[PDB]
RNA sequence: UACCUGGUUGAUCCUGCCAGUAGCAUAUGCUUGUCUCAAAGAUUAAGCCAUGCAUGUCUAAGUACGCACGGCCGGUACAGUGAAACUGCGAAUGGCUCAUUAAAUCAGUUAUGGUUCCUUUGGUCGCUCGACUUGGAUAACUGUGGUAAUUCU
RNA sequence: UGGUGACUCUAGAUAACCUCGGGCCGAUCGCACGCCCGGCGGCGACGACCCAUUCGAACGUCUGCCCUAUCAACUUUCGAUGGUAGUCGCCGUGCCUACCAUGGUGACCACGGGUGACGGGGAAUCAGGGUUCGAUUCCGGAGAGGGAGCCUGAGAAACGGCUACCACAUCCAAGGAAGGCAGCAGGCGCGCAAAUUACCCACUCCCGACCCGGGGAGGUAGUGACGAAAAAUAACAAUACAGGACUCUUUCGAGGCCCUGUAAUUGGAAUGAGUCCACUUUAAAUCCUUUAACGAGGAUCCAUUGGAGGGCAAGUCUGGUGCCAGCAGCCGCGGUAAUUCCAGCUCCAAUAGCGUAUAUUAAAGUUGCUGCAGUUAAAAAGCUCGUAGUUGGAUCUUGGGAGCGGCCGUCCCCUGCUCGGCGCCGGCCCGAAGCGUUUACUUUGAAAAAA
């Protein structure tokens, strides 16, 4: 190509959207935004595919242009806006509020929350730099550039920010023992306490994470978030609590629920 | 670039020797017994069994209490048991190899419609299926391949809509009754 | 004896409508026309038949049962606002131009030949 | 299903090939009732192409003195819909084909502490100590044309 | 200041510069209107230098490609490998200039040539190994008749942009002008070989100032035995008949309570191929599904395609021909009793399909790593030395401490020196860094587009 791509083929789309392979040739190419192409859930896919308010994409136009969908605090009239991790989708006329947190299976769950909870989100810091006149700047995973943060906030921390203002409240240091939502790789959606960050100078730093049931796994650092101090999370978790019960456990727990419920 | 599937696979394999007397006359023994229409209907069943019987060979190489085996093996066992081919008493996957073509031909709708005794032969059974007289849980089944789930065996009866049930009496009777009153005057 | 049980019932306050999958039992006789289902769903949900839009029916093989999708809007002012134009046109309350896209394109490419007010004098 | 079978000899046992055997994908012959999916000018000629179409676009929010249509309460200009035209944005995506290309392309894997980046998103946008809004156009419009001929001017 | 594994980083301080072909610091536009003895403000739209972010792009790292030696040396003062300093470029770089140095690659196959070679994800075949294919819907690359040059723009060396040349070709009042279907249809040609000059933006998405317009992208029909899935072409009874159960008879024969099979015998009951109102379908239709009515006895609403010597399932039948005609993948058949030709009847095989030609896979353990062969069937150099290649003797830790089940089983231990927590009157037990023969190997982990 001799310039940037504007289309995205349906078969080329990221797997976690769970678009089929018979409705169209194309998937919605996410609008350029805070989150990456492969990590974002576009608004259209959150409206017509998950919540199923709309049927078509012209329906999602007729909902979003009425200025109802308020993604993390601000109204969005773009059907392919990249809503991503921790972002709070406020549909005001239904009085519903959703936080995009990963189900323990790779896909984003529909996780309803209290409006009292919806007022804040939690942001992983990507880097810190010192701006034009000794002014410490602070770039997050959703690119929310914050000037004059608390000086004890380091590179891989998280920051509980208030959406109505956009100011930090409290920050979780990246320390051993803290809860961790894993936001990349095979362990996507998994929750557990951070056990051992193993430093590999020049290469990628792996980070071991012990689960709540004790089923310890590992991840590359870059794919790791922190959601709580020790064992207590700062969000509401989606059901399953980021454990990833095995295919055998899933099977007999489907059999058990299928017979017991009736 | 189009929104079409393309995914499709054969459901049979043609045998290597086309004129084994022993095979030709064992596959016609199957066709007669169970009222099938060509050797493709036999090579279809034989091929499904061979794929099952291939998957079983693959799982018996694996170590006992392997998570992939225990999951995959039980998944295969509960499927064969569910269609009435294997027993709940015998659900252990070394029995899957001790399993043959008559066990799958017994579970196809043609043979159940016959061996319930609501048909007069196996050839009459296809007629009753093809001519949409029979149903399974208020679903009229046109097609005699239909493998009957073990729970779904007892719900084979005539259609509510067919003249064999409480249905609108057929074309020949209604024409002969109208000709009968056209004959009487 | 034509019965309608509804299913997957949902109230979209953001399109100002009810929406539900419509299971229609009609054993003995044909797929009943959308008008009849629309009248039979109006008396079910205590509304006027004009704000109901009930489409896309696929009769199950054997044919004692079909399934369509249904919508009940709050007002016709909402219905006419946020409904696709073809499904309004089935209720005889929208008309589109008869002119095919072959005419519109040949007009468009003739209109590019001339500049200014002469663009009006292409179709007579 | 981890398979062979005919053929050199008067007969034999071999080497060994030819032929058979089943699949597959192009062509093709004869034949074809129902029904569901569905490849389809690649192979030769990345040969040559008549004609028609395939990239255009307006909001409450750049610019409206086309009475083209139309509201009335005017003299504090500007109701409103709105063709054209200037402006802005796109036209670098999509689609097609596979000629060229053999450490090239491509793939996995890293680097960019060696770069660039419309757009979105978030910062930033009285930080400089030194006019109640300015200047000349040009298009649409009107008029005068020229060329056999162009989306010419 | 803060940061990295590492900066000549980011930030700070000083001194200056700051291009006239010019960095910013808003002369912009809409809704709702207010507070205030003229001044203060809300909700947006657009604009904007720079940082960051997203979307990428570009050039680099490691490793991986088919045949060829009738290609063994190649590259280099018209840059080959490197140094140094510039120019150019978005930046790193012989990218390019100037002066230097004489390098660089190769029997671990360079270099040259070929390829019916875009690469890959993948496809076919398939015991286990493999072999062959991949133009072809996803990813990446390339090109728009062949080369070349460039305008605009964030992005192009763009071709549904422009500028030449080459080839071809259109219009012409003969002065001139216009062209690029390897986009969608369609045409010619080429061939063994491939479809409609259809309907539509409703779906899928994309573009725009944009809930509103546009999209041969895409969707929908048409052609379609490329191919895949399901699956009609009859079922049932009464009769003549025949074979097999039984009382019974030496044999015949009797009965059919029981079966099973065949006759253009007869009898109703069937249901869809088709015909066809209506609904449903859908942008509008179609097909499908549903469903009134019609719609079957030679059920003429008529199943072909190939065979019948062997391999290879199935006639030593009848009529014709007479080494002719022909069949025949191979072996063979044909010269007067043709099991093979040409037909009739009959039978077999697959069956809505079946034959043929050709590529290709298995069969091929007839390319052999698994796994072939080399006395005589094809094959060991005339003989020896010999460098890369390949292969290479033995040898370097073991006993028990702790615990369980009934002498044997399954576990924890048999490297050492800066920073703090289960504690103690400078250090003892232990927690977290950092150095620790180097590799192959094996096991685990991370990471690895979907299809």
Swiss-Prot record, chain A:
Recorded GO MF terms: rRNA binding; structural constituent of ribosome
Single GO cellular component term: cytosolic small ribosomal subunit
Coiled coil region boundaries: none
InterPro entries in the cross-refs: KOW, Rib_uL2_dom2, Ribosomal_eS4, Ribosomal_eS4_C, Ribosomal_eS4_central_region, Ribosomal_eS4_central_sf, Ribosomal_eS4_KOW, Ribosomal_eS4_N
GO BP term, example: translation
Signal peptide: none
Residue span, S4 RNA-binding domain: 41-103
Keyword entries, A-Z: Acetylation, Cytoplasm, Isopeptide bond, Nucleus, Ribonucleoprotein, Ribosomal protein, RNA-binding, rRNA-binding, Ubl conjugation
Sequence positions bearing N6-acetyllysine: 232
Family of the protein in this entry: Belongs to the eukaryotic ribosomal protein eS4 family.
HAMAP family referenced in this protein's UniProt entry, alphabetically: Ribosomal_eS4 (MF_00485)
Quaternary context: Component of the small ribosomal subunit. Part of the small subunit (SSU) processome, composed of more than 70 proteins and the RNA chaperone small nucleolar RNA (snoRNA) U3. Identified in a IGF2BP1-dependent mRNP granule complex containing untranslated mRNAs.
Function: Component of the small ribosomal subunit. The ribosome is a large ribonucleoprotein complex responsible for the synthesis of proteins in the cell. Part of the small subunit (SSU) processome, first precursor of the small eukaryotic ribosomal subunit. During the assembly of the SSU processome in the nucleolus, many ribosome biogenesis factors, an RNA chaperone and ribosomal proteins associate with the nascent pre-rRNA and work in concert to generate RNA folding, modifications, rearrangements and cleavage as well as targeted degradation of pre-ribosomal RNA by the RNA exosome.
The protein's name in its UniProt record: Small ribosomal subunit protein eS4
Protein encoded by which gene: RPS4X
From Swiss-Prot, chain B:
SUPFAM superfamilies registered for this protein in UniProt: Alpha-L RNA-binding motif (SSF55174)
Position of the signal peptide: none
Source lineage: Eukaryota, Metazoa, Chordata, Craniata, Vertebrata
Name by which UniProt lists this protein: Small ribosomal subunit protein uS4
Domain S4 RNA-binding: 107-181
Keywords, sorted A to Z: Acetylation, Cytoplasm, Isopeptide bond, Nucleus, Phosphoprotein, Ribonucleoprotein, Ribosomal protein, RNA-binding, rRNA-binding, Ubl conjugation
Region (Disordered): 161-185
Source organism, top-level taxon: Eukaryota
PANTHER family referenced in this protein's UniProt entry, alphabetically: 30S 40S RIBOSOMAL PROTEIN, SMALL RIBOSOMAL SUBUNIT PROTEIN US4
GO molecular function, one term: rRNA binding
Location of this chain's protein in the cell: Cytoplasm; Nucleus, Nucleolus
GO BP annotations listed: ribosomal small subunit biogenesis; translation
Cross-link (Glycyl lysine isopeptide (Lys-Gly) (interchain with G-Cter in SUMO2)): 92, 138
Pfam families named in the record: Ribosomal_S4, S4
């Amino acid at each position: 190509a001799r310039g940037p791509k504007k289309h995205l083929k349906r078969v080329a789309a990221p797997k976690h959207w769970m678009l089929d392979k018979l409705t169209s040739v194309f998937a919605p190419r996410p609008s350029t935004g805070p989150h990456k192409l492969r990590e974002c859930l576009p608004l259209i896919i959150f409206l017509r595919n998950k919540l199923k308010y709309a049927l078509t994409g012209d329906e999602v136009k007729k909902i979003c242009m009425q200025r109802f969908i308020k993604i993390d605090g601000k109204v969005r009239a773009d059907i392919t806006y990249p809503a991503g991790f921790m972002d709070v989708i406020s549909i005001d006329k239904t009085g519903e509020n959703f936080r995009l947190i990963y189900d323990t299976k790779g896909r984003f769950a529909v996780h309803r929350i209290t409006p009292e909870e919806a007022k804040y989100k939690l942001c992983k810091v990507r880097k810190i730099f010192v701006g034009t006149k000794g002014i410490p700047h602070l770039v997050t995973h959703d690119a929310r550039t914050i000037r004059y943060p608390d000086p004890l906030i380091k590179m891989n921390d998280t920051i509980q920010i208030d959406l109505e203002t956009g100011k930090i409240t409290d920050f979780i240091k990246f320390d051993t023992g803290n809860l961790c939502m894993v936001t990349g790789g095979a362990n996507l959606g998994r929750i557990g306490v951070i056990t051992n960050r193993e430093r590999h100078p020049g290469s990628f730093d792996v980070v071991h994470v012990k689960d709540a049931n004790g089923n310890s796994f590992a991840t590359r650092l870059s794919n790791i978030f922190v959601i709580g101090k020790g064992n207590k999370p700062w969000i509401s978790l989606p059901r399953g609590k980021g454990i990833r019960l095995t295919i055998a456990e899933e099977r007999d727990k489907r059999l058990a629920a299928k017979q017991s419920s009736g | 670039p189009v929104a079409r599937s393309w995914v499709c696979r054969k459901t049979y394999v043609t045998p290597r020797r086309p004129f084994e007397k022993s095979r030709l006359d064992q596959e016609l023994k199957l066709i007669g017994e169970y009222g099938l229409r060509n050797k493709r209907e036999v090579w279809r069943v034989k091929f499904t069994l061979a794929k099952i019987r291939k998957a079983a060979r693959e799982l018996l190489t694996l170590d006992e209490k392997d998570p992939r085996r225990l999951f995959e093996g039980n998944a295969l066992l509960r499927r064969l048991v569910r269609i009435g081919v294997l027993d709940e008493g015998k659900m252990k996957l070394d029995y899957i190899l001790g399993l043959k073509i008559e066990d799958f031909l017994e579970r196809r709708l043609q043979t159940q419609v016959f061996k319930l005794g609501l048909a007069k032969s196996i050839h009459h059974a296809r007629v009753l299926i093809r001519q949409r007289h029979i149903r399974v849980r208020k679903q009229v089944v046109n097609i005699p391949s239909f493998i009957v789930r073990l729970d779904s065996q007892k719900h084979i009866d005539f259609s509510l809509r067919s003249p064999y049930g409480g249905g609108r009496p057929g074309r020949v009777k209604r024409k002969n009754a109208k000709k009968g009153q056209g004959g009487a005057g | 004896t034509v019965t309608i049980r509804t299913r997957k019932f949902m109230t979209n306050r953001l399109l100002q409508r009810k929406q539900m999958v419509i299971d229609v039992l009609h054993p003995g006789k044909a797929t009943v026309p959308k008008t009849e289902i629309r009248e039979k769903l109006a008396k079910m949900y205590k509304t006027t038949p004009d704000v109901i839009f009930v489409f896309g029916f696929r009769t199950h093989f054997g044919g004692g049962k079909t399934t369509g999708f249904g919508m009940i809007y709050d007002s016709l002012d909402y219905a006419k606002k946020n409904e696709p134009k073809h499904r309004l046109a089935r209720h005889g309350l929208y008309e589109k131009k008869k002119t095919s896209r072959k005419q519109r394109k040949e007009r468009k490419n003739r209109m590019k030949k001339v500049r200014g007010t002469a663009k009006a004098n292409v179709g007579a």
